[PDB]
Scaffold this active site. Structure first.
Site, PDB file in Angstrom:
ATOM      1  N   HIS A  77       0.821  -1.213   0.000  1.00  7.90           N
ATOM      2  CA  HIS A  77       0.000   0.000   0.000  1.00  7.90           C
ATOM      3  C   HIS A  77       0.854   1.261   0.000  1.00  7.90           C
ATOM      4  O   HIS A  77       0.964   1.972   1.005  1.00  7.90           O
ATOM      5  CB  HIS A  77      -1.021  -0.013   1.138  1.00  7.90           C
ATOM      6  CG  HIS A  77      -2.170  -0.943   0.889  1.00  7.90           C
ATOM      7  ND1 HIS A  77      -2.332  -2.129   1.570  1.00  7.90           N
ATOM      8  CD2 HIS A  77      -3.189  -0.879  -0.001  1.00  7.90           C
ATOM      9  CE1 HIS A  77      -3.404  -2.754   1.117  1.00  7.90           C
ATOM     10  NE2 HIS A  77      -3.945  -2.015   0.167  1.00  7.90           N
ATOM     11  N   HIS A  81       1.352   1.264  -5.803  1.00  8.11           N
ATOM     12  CA  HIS A  81       0.001   0.724  -5.887  1.00  8.11           C
ATOM     13  C   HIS A  81      -0.975   1.757  -6.409  1.00  8.11           C
ATOM     14  O   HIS A  81      -1.796   1.473  -7.291  1.00  8.11           O
ATOM     15  CB  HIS A  81      -0.469   0.211  -4.522  1.00  8.11           C
ATOM     16  CG  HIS A  81      -1.946  -0.041  -4.449  1.00  8.11           C
ATOM     17  ND1 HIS A  81      -2.607  -0.874  -5.328  1.00  8.11           N
ATOM     18  CD2 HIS A  81      -2.893   0.453  -3.614  1.00  8.11           C
ATOM     19  CE1 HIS A  81      -3.895  -0.894  -5.026  1.00  8.11           C
ATOM     20  NE2 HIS A  81      -4.093  -0.094  -3.993  1.00  8.11           N
ATOM     21  N   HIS A 117      -6.605   7.238  -3.490  1.00  8.41           N
ATOM     22  CA  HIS A 117      -7.509   6.366  -2.705  1.00  8.41           C
ATOM     23  C   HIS A 117      -6.885   5.644  -1.508  1.00  8.41           C
ATOM     24  O   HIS A 117      -7.595   5.083  -0.659  1.00  8.41           O
ATOM     25  CB  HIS A 117      -8.184   5.328  -3.617  1.00  8.41           C
ATOM     26  CG  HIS A 117      -7.344   4.109  -3.875  1.00  8.41           C
ATOM     27  ND1 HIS A 117      -6.462   4.024  -4.938  1.00  8.41           N
ATOM     28  CD2 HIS A 117      -7.251   2.929  -3.209  1.00  8.41           C
ATOM     29  CE1 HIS A 117      -5.858   2.847  -4.908  1.00  8.41           C
ATOM     30  NE2 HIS A 117      -6.323   2.161  -3.872  1.00  8.41           N
ATOM     31  N   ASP A 118      -5.563   5.624  -1.432  1.00  9.18           N
ATOM     32  CA  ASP A 118      -4.912   4.926  -0.323  1.00  9.18           C
ATOM     33  C   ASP A 118      -3.910   5.820   0.393  1.00  9.18           C
ATOM     34  O   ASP A 118      -3.054   5.330   1.107  1.00  9.18           O
ATOM     35  CB  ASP A 118      -4.211   3.665  -0.834  1.00  9.18           C
ATOM     36  CG  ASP A 118      -5.080   2.423  -0.698  1.00  9.18           C
ATOM     37  OD1 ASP A 118      -5.896   2.423   0.239  1.00  9.18           O
ATOM     38  OD2 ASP A 118      -4.951   1.468  -1.506  1.00  9.18           O
ATOM     39  N   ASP A 213      -8.436  -0.904  -8.483  1.00  7.12           N
ATOM     40  CA  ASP A 213      -7.767  -1.076  -7.202  1.00  7.12           C
ATOM     41  C   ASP A 213      -7.203  -2.504  -7.099  1.00  7.12           C
ATOM     42  O   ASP A 213      -6.157  -2.727  -6.510  1.00  7.12           O
ATOM     43  CB  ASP A 213      -8.817  -0.783  -6.122  1.00  7.12           C
ATOM     44  CG  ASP A 213      -8.265  -0.756  -4.715  1.00  7.12           C
ATOM     45  OD1 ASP A 213      -7.046  -0.806  -4.501  1.00  7.12           O
ATOM     46  OD2 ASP A 213      -9.098  -0.658  -3.798  1.00  7.12           O
ATOM     47  N   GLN A 245      -5.201 -16.965  -2.695  1.00  6.19           N
ATOM     48  CA  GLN A 245      -5.367 -16.172  -3.909  1.00  6.19           C
ATOM     49  C   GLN A 245      -6.561 -16.658  -4.701  1.00  6.19           C
ATOM     50  O   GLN A 245      -7.332 -15.847  -5.222  1.00  6.19           O
ATOM     51  CB  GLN A 245      -4.096 -16.184  -4.767  1.00  6.19           C
ATOM     52  CG  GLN A 245      -2.992 -15.338  -4.162  1.00  6.19           C
ATOM     53  CD  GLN A 245      -3.418 -13.880  -3.999  1.00  6.19           C
ATOM     54  OE1 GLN A 245      -3.985 -13.497  -2.976  1.00  6.19           O
ATOM     55  NE2 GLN A 245      -3.140 -13.066  -5.006  1.00  6.19           N
TER      56      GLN A 245
HETATM   57  C1  NI0 Z   1      -0.982 -12.528  -1.659  1.00  4.53           C
HETATM   58  C2  NI0 Z   1      -1.145 -12.792  -0.147  1.00  4.53           C
HETATM   59  C3  NI0 Z   1      -2.538 -12.663   0.443  1.00  4.53           C
HETATM   60  O1  NI0 Z   1      -3.580 -12.348  -0.456  1.00  4.53           O
HETATM   61  C4  NI0 Z   1      -4.927 -12.329  -0.057  1.00  4.53           C
HETATM   62  C5  NI0 Z   1      -5.423 -13.284   0.856  1.00  4.53           C
HETATM   63  C6  NI0 Z   1      -6.786 -13.255   1.234  1.00  4.53           C
HETATM   64  C7  NI0 Z   1      -7.626 -12.283   0.686  1.00  4.53           C
HETATM   65  S1  NI0 Z   1      -9.341 -12.214   1.153  1.00  4.53           S
HETATM   66  O2  NI0 Z   1      -9.703 -13.539   1.698  1.00  4.53           O
HETATM   67  O3  NI0 Z   1     -10.214 -11.839   0.016  1.00  4.53           O
HETATM   68  N1  NI0 Z   1      -9.475 -11.045   2.285  1.00  4.53           N
HETATM   69  C8  NI0 Z   1      -8.634 -11.085   3.451  1.00  4.53           C
HETATM   70  C9  NI0 Z   1      -9.013 -10.105   4.520  1.00  4.53           C
HETATM   71  N2  NI0 Z   1      -9.280  -8.791   4.006  1.00  4.53           N
HETATM   72  C10 NI0 Z   1     -10.487  -8.131   4.483  1.00  4.53           C
HETATM   73  C11 NI0 Z   1      -8.966  -8.692   2.612  1.00  4.53           C
HETATM   74  C12 NI0 Z   1      -9.698  -9.715   1.798  1.00  4.53           C
HETATM   75  C13 NI0 Z   1      -7.140 -11.329  -0.227  1.00  4.53           C
HETATM   76  C14 NI0 Z   1      -5.795 -11.355  -0.588  1.00  4.53           C
HETATM   77  C15 NI0 Z   1      -5.335 -10.314  -1.606  1.00  4.53           C
HETATM   78  N3  NI0 Z   1      -5.703  -9.030  -1.431  1.00  4.53           N
HETATM   79  C16 NI0 Z   1      -5.353  -8.066  -2.309  1.00  4.53           C
HETATM   80  C17 NI0 Z   1      -5.797  -6.649  -1.998  1.00  4.53           C
HETATM   81  C18 NI0 Z   1      -4.841  -5.998  -1.007  1.00  4.53           C
HETATM   82  C19 NI0 Z   1      -4.568  -8.416  -3.452  1.00  4.53           C
HETATM   83  C20 NI0 Z   1      -4.132  -7.364  -4.495  1.00  4.53           C
HETATM   84  C21 NI0 Z   1      -4.997  -7.254  -5.719  1.00  4.53           C
HETATM   85  C22 NI0 Z   1      -4.213  -9.779  -3.612  1.00  4.53           C
HETATM   86  O4  NI0 Z   1      -3.463 -10.207  -4.693  1.00  4.53           O
HETATM   87  N4  NI0 Z   1      -4.617 -10.702  -2.682  1.00  4.53           N
HETATM   88 MG    MG Z   2      -7.317   0.813   0.587  1.00  5.14          MG
HETATM   89 ZN    ZN Z   3      -5.962   0.164  -2.895  1.00 13.30          ZN
END
Ligand code: NI0
Ligand code: MG
Ligand code: ZN
Length: 286
Positions: A77, A81, A117-118, A213, A245
């Site tokens: 973040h 990003h 936004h961040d 985003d 993922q």
């Molecule tokens: C790569 C290591 C961990 O990645 C993730 C693991 C779990 C989740 S999630 O189960 O949908 N969730 C976890 C808890 N939180 C409220 C965010 C959403 C999202 C993610 C995740 N969030 C994001 C958004 C920060 C991205 C960037 C597009 C991503 O690639 N994966």
């Molecule tokens: Mg944010």
């Molecule tokens: Zn963002």
């Protein structure tokens, strides 16, 4: 002021030379200065500098201010990003052909929101209440001496733009996205989706923000792997990752890029990139 002179003095290559029209764009090869130039090119080719009489050095200073108020010490973040989120917004407007569906004021606001936004994010492990903070940061920069890129707007235009910006930034709250997407998909399902309706326009803009985003999830595999690493570094450092993922792609991303493609067939590459990444993570999941 060192960095400002160099930036204000530089020539800005075309969107084409900068690759910022490609959905598969990546910033790893770019220096801070170069992301700044890319950002200038985004404002320019969206006609924003022309239509709203932005002064060059004000835009430059504003970009530097934005960049400066992200924390470099935060793995994902950070400015990169924000920058990528704006490049995706740019790509979707241009190559995705969403541009023609929106007003200049809407486009101005999305671009600003995407970059802002961040703002001042401290990392997920330090904590739409946070999104209110990001917009507050956005507003403070917009009102700082020398950074007033909106000065050329009338007072009416100005208020409309801030409202769109605010909504746009608040929309990046994944909880709001989950809350609101139901209506959007439903509308698409029934082929009832209509941008002429104010309520639906605003809803679309929210969805578009989330789509950009999360755009890293759509990137070519070698790039996605790299960003996922940054995300994991932030999540855990500040073997279950591939299934996470896949869960994230299934729960949050796929339907969004599906809907977005329905709105505009030219946004397909985001959907396509997302599906391929799911294949790769799914395979690693075993
Ligand atoms: C790569 C290591 C961990 O990645 C993730 C693991 C779990 C989740 S999630 O189960 O949908 N969730 C976890 C808890 N939180 C409220 C965010 C959403 C999202 C993610 C995740 N969030 C994001 C958004 C920060 C991205 C960037 C597009 C991503 O690639 N994966
Ligand atoms: Mg944010
Ligand atoms: Zn963002």
């Amino acid at each position: 002021t060192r960095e400002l002179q160099s930036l204000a003095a530089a020539v800005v290559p075309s969107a084409q030379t900068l690759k910022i029209t490609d959905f598969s764009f990546s910033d790893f090869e770019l220096s801070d200065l170069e992301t700044a130039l890319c950002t200038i090119r985004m404002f320019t080719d969206l006609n924003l500098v022309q239509n709203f009489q932005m002064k060059h050095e004000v835009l430059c200073r504003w970009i530097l201010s934005v960049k400066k108020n992200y924390r470099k010490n935060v793995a994902y973040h950070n400015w990169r990003h924000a920058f990528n989120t704006a490049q995706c917004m740019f790509a979707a407007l241009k190559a995705g052909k969403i541009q023609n569906k929106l007003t200049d004021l809407e486009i101005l606001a999305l671009l600003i929101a995407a970059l802002s936004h961040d703002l001042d994010h401290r990392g997920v492990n330090n904590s739409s209440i946070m999104e209110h903070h990001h917009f507050d940061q956005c507003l403070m920069i917009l009102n700082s001496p020398g950074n007033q890129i909106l000065s050329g707007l009338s007072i009416e235009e100005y208020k409309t733009t801030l409202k769109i910006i605010k909504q746009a930034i608040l929309a990046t709250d994944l909880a709001l996205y989950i809350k609101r997407r139901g209506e959007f998909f439903e509308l698409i399902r029934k082929n009832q989706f209509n941008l002429e309706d104010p309520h639906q326009k605003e809803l679309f803009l929210a969805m578009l923000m989330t789509a950009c985003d999360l755009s890293a999830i759509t990137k070519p595999w070698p790039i996605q792997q790299r960003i996922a690493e940054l995300v994991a570094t932030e999540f855990f450092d500040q073997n279950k990752i591939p299934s996470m993922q896949v869960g994230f792609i299934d729960a949050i991303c796929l339907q969004l890029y599906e809907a977005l493609t329905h709105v505009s067939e030219d946004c397909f590459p985001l959907l396509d990139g997302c599906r391929k990444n799911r294949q790769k993570w799914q395979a690693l999941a075993e």
